[PDB]
Amino acid sequence: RLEECNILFELLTEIQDEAGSMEKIVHKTLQRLSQLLARDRCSMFICRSRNGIPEVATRLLNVTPTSKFEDNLVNPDKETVFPLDIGIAGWVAHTKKFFNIPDVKKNNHFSDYLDKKTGYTTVNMMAIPITQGKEVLAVVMALNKLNASEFSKEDEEVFKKYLNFISLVLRNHHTSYLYNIESRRSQMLLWSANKVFEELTDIERQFHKALYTIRMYLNCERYSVGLLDMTPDGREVNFYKIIDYILHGKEEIKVIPTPPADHWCLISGLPTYVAENGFICNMMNAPADEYFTFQKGPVDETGWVIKNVLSLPIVNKKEEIVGVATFYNRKDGKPFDEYDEQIIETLTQFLGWSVLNTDTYDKMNKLENRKDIAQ
Amino acid sequence: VSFKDMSRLEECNILFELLTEIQDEAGSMEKIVHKTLQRLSQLLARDRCSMFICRSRNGIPEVATRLLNVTPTSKFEDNLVNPDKETVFPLDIGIAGWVAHTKKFFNIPDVKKNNHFSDYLDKKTGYTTVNMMAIPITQGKEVLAVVMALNKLNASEFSKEDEEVFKKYLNFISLVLRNHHTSYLYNIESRRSQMLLWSANKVFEELTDIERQFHKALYTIRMYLNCERYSVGLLDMTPDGREVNFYKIIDYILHGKEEIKVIPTPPADHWCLISGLPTYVAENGFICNMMNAPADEYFTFQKGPVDETGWVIKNVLSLPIVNKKEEIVGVATFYNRKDGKPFDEYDEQIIETLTQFLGWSVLNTDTYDKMNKLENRKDIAQ
The missing domain is CATH 3.30.450.40 (GAF domain)
Structure with missing residues (x-):
């Protein structure tokens, strides 16, 4: 009225x-x-x-x-x-x-x-x-x-x-x-690419360079990229390195190689799942049977707990899976969603293609050899 | 009441x-x-x-x-x-x-x-x-x-x-x-990002040379600029002002019947280069967004030409594409926003984004050359 x-x-x-x-x-x-x-x-x-x-x-x-x-x-x-x-x-x-x-x-x-x-x-x-x-x-x-x-x-x-x-x-x-999804997406690439093109290098330094340079952008508390042995499809697996980014707590960055059976990210069997099948895997809690994400209320000494996880494959231009990048816990306690999925696929894809330089590097060396065994 | x-x-x-x-x-x-x-x-x-x-x-x-x-x-x-x-x-x-x-x-x-x-x-x-x-x-x-x-x-x-x-x-x-x-802005960011996403994809498709890489990329993303024309000119590189020489140029026409020309040792009377802009930006490394044709200093085509097609220049935006040591390697130049309005700040933003990226990808072109001089400069020994 x-x-x-x-x-x-x-x-x-x-x-x-x-x-x-x-x-x-x-x-x-x-x-x-x-x-x-x-x-x-x-x-x-x-x-x-x-x-x-x-x-x-x-x-x-x-x-x-x-x-x-x-x-x-x-x-x-x-x-x-x-x-x-x-x-x-x-x-x-x-x-x-x-x-x-x-x-x-x-x-x-x-x-x-x-x-x-x-x-x-x-x-x-x-x-x-x-x-x-x-x-x-x-x-x-x-x-x-x-x-x-x-x-x-x-x-x-x-x-x-x-x-x-x-x-x-x-x-x-x-x-x-949406504006910040797409801005986050577009900054991510922009730097992901600034690194890649900086200097011709191998996978570890490239991936590492990049994922470091854009840590802020994921609004994310932990994530581990995990490199696959490349010598399809499933159970032929072997993660041979694995690079953790601990960005919640006091900021540490590990670069484990020949990583253990029970590495803190692997223990759930998610990154295997993603290795053998090839599909993005948003999920909200620690009880999903057909998984062993850490029900325990720490992962470690810091008492850090796991809520939401989202893991994706990182894939070749030949389309074999080059690695598996799992993300943990958004900074504002929300579950991973729709648009987290998209900007992170935007990333994972952009590297999976970057492997060309990776692959080129190793060749630029095999040939810098064969050449230097003439003189 | x-x-x-x-x-x-x-x-x-x-x-x-x-x-x-x-x-x-x-x-x-x-x-x-x-x-x-x-x-x-x-x-x-x-x-x-x-x-x-x-x-x-x-x-x-x-x-x-x-x-x-x-x-x-x-x-x-x-x-x-x-x-x-x-x-x-x-x-x-x-x-x-x-x-x-x-x-x-x-x-x-x-x-x-x-x-x-x-x-x-x-x-x-x-x-x-x-x-x-x-x-x-x-x-x-x-x-x-x-x-x-x-x-x-x-x-x-x-x-x-x-x-x-x-x-x-x-x-x-x-x-x-x-x-x-x-x-x-949501849509600007979308446009900024997809431009990158795809250019990246083409860059990473097959180790290739500069022209082939540029054309590859710039073609794929023509949708994203919402621009009516844009020619990309490659300078000779054998660091500034007048020692210039555009060796190739490569036109993108998306007005009416789409045609893509590829113009080696292009004239001076080239429709883009007559203006004088692409050269000017070639001599100083600085972005230049216009409104309209006439702008005193330049001879930019005033004509209801330049084409038979009777297409007319209103607005021009020009930027350079840069090396890593940072010579001006090329000079992109974009013409008339499909949908009417002048180029603005946000265009400047995402197009420089694109332009920067291309500059950075020149690694892969130099790398390709070096690579070719090995599959070869090893086969003089072997």
């Missing part, structure tokens, strides 16, 4: 000043949109796409007009994750469509988990996805109508015409995130 | 309208800003707004027309300014330029009583102004745009109740303009 907008203009300043967080602005909007909508609590599901698959997770929860954000936010550790074929939000995200629910008890796509897990059960709810281009960024819902079994088609219009706003905000956030 | 008390209620009519619109992704920044300049006029008794755009070229910033003379009524196409017709200002001159320099808000009462005025637009259109409130739009350090509401209708100053209404909505504009201009 009367005091609708006001808070929008307020919030437009709060964007105006690049200082603002996104989530605090979405949380504030979900406040009045629960008050002003007479619905019990709102909540937000963040949508990402690890591996080929996509999925959803908690992010904001139980937004009462009163509740402080600092309550409302779900830190990434404590997030809860559904595939699209489970829960309403998943379905909302598959369908890319709006829904009003008169009764979720009379509903196939039900999410009985967070009802039962938190207690505070649900009866009715209206839900929508936020998208950008073809991409589905988020799923917002209003839960539990304050007055009797269904929301109005007057309510919808508000909801709709307010997510209009959040949408605007969410997209701008994501356009920024 | 009172003239104000409604006018307030009416603001949210306009706002939720704008949000509603900008939820459809194509179009179009300029459309939604134009639409918003309309509703300001309506809701702020202004004869006509206008929007300027800010950019940089070489190290220097500048401002230029874009949306002009927006009543609460003028139709989009009567307002949107095509680049061919755009009018351009250095910051040290005119009010927008000054505002863009000073990153500041102004509520100018008497324009004529102002020493940063230019009589150009109002002399060009005869649409004389007198009052304007003018803001800058900004993303971090930089300045995206400048928006000025003109001629306060039934008054002589814009009320401080206008100032704040102006400001109010400009935050909308600003979210849109950042969320646009970010998305442009």
Whole structure:
């Protein structure tokens, strides 16, 4: 009716000043949109796409007009994750469509988990996805109508015409995130190549040079590149060197050769998997059976723990696997995603092609010999 | 209900309208800003707004027309300014330029009583102004745009109740303009990176010689520059000024019927080289981004030529490709942005990126030579 907008203009300043967080602005909007909508609590599901698959997770929860954000936010550790074929939000995200629910008890796509897990059960709810281009960024819902079994088609219009706003905000956030993906990608290459072309050398120094020069860019706490014996496809393996980059804690860089059976990265059997099969392997925790990532709460003396791992092959222009580069734990506790996958494939590929100089080097030597055994 | 008390209620009519619109992704920044300049006029008794755009070229910033003379009524196409017709200002001159320099808000009462005025637009259109409130739009350090509401209708100053209404909505504009201009940079970075990614790929396909490597790469990425023409000229190298000699040159024509010529010991009357630019940049190692053909010093083709095809040069950007010891090895030069607008800072950025990389890849060409002189200068012994 009367005091609708006001808070929008307020919030437009709060964007105006690049200082603002996104989530605090979405949380504030979900406040009045629960008050002003007479619905019990709102909540937000963040949508990402690890591996080929996509999925959803908690992010904001139980937004009462009163509740402080600092309550409302779900830190990434404590997030809860559904595939699209489970829960309403998943379905909302598959369908890319709006829904009003008169009764979720009379509903196939039900999410009985967070009802039962938190207690505070649900009866009715209206839900929508936020998208950008073809991409589905988020799923917002209003839960539990304050007055009797269904929301109005007057309510919808508000909801709709307010997510209009959040949408605007969410997209701008994501356009920024993409901007830094692609900048990170493009700096990475740029230096990866500045090294490679510096001077004709062998694989170890080239790879090493490079991966060092761009350590910052991976927003990553550990990673080990692992060189394969090259004398297809699987179980003929042998990692013969292995170069660790410890970038969380006190910065050390090992260059193990004839690396052990139980090197701290190898012990999981992931890099073998990637050696024998050839596929990027995003994963979130330490229990994936068919693996021995380090369930133990240290890896070592520093007490460092493993959460998210993502490992890829490094491949020839002939397409044999030259090595296997595993990455560990993003710097901000998020799982590896879609776009981490892409910029790191951008890297792994760019070296796998660089092997030409590597290979050239060894030849430039065999021939500098044969020549110097004339005179 | 009172003239104000409604006018307030009416603001949210306009706002939720704008949000509603900008939820459809194509179009179009300029459309939604134009639409918003309309509703300001309506809701702020202004004869006509206008929007300027800010950019940089070489190290220097500048401002230029874009949306002009927006009543609460003028139709989009009567307002949107095509680049061919755009009018351009250095910051040290005119009010927008000054505002863009000073990153500041102004509520100018008497324009004529102002020493940063230019009589150009109002002399060009005869649409004389007198009052304007003018803001800058900004993303971090930089300045995206400048928006000025003109001629306060039934008054002589814009009320401080206008100032704040102006400001109010400009935050909308600003979210849109950042969320646009970010998305442009997103696309620049994509273009920067793929250019690298592929050039790399071709460089690493087979040990090959310079021409073959350049052509290989430069061909593959023609899509990525969004440029209408670009010739790449190779200097002789057997470190600067006049000892020049472009031995090969190699034209990339992506206007109309695509044709790629390969021109050994190219003339001087070569369409690119007549200009004098590629040579000039050959003598000093410094990037040169133009607007337009004529630029006094040079004879750049003024002609509706140079072709039978009747293609016409507007904008030229030229950079050098550098060694490792750092002679100018070649001189790339790019012509007319497909999609209308002058080369800018961000072009400079990603094209230098490309140009740098090529410079660095010359390892692999020297290496190839050395390699050939072994599969040979061993076979004189063996």
